[PDB]
Amino acid sequence: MKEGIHPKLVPARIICGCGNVIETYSTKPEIYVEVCSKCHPFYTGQQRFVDTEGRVERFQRRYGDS
Template sequence: MQQDKHPEYHPVVFRDRAAGYAFLTRSTASSEQTIEWDDGETYPVIDVEISSESHPFYTGRARTVDTEGRVARFERRYGGTEPGEGS
């Protein structure tokens, strides 16, 4: 195996500003900004827009939006089954 081919793998804090949540993990990502973590050590911090704490799928706030009756329009156009008919 060739040496010095892979990027450095080190502890990094990812911070979700929208949810006010941060977590420490290992990553190859780097940043000039640092943060002091609960263990007293200083780690690079990367701000993210969405994490599992703020994403609608993971929080249960996801909704399905049927704008303009798209499902009904699709069924009319392509011959969907009528309500009450068995499959």
């Protein structure tokens, strides 16, 4: 890397809905991230929270008992 006009890239910290990613090693140390999927909410480390498919399911169940 030519010397000048370049980000420092110094060991970092970082955060989330989870704890730290202590890998770090970035520009601009100590960053705060919204939330991740990995850290396993939201897809990876599959929760399938909030989940769908009721619409074909529904008008079956309630329907002829009501």
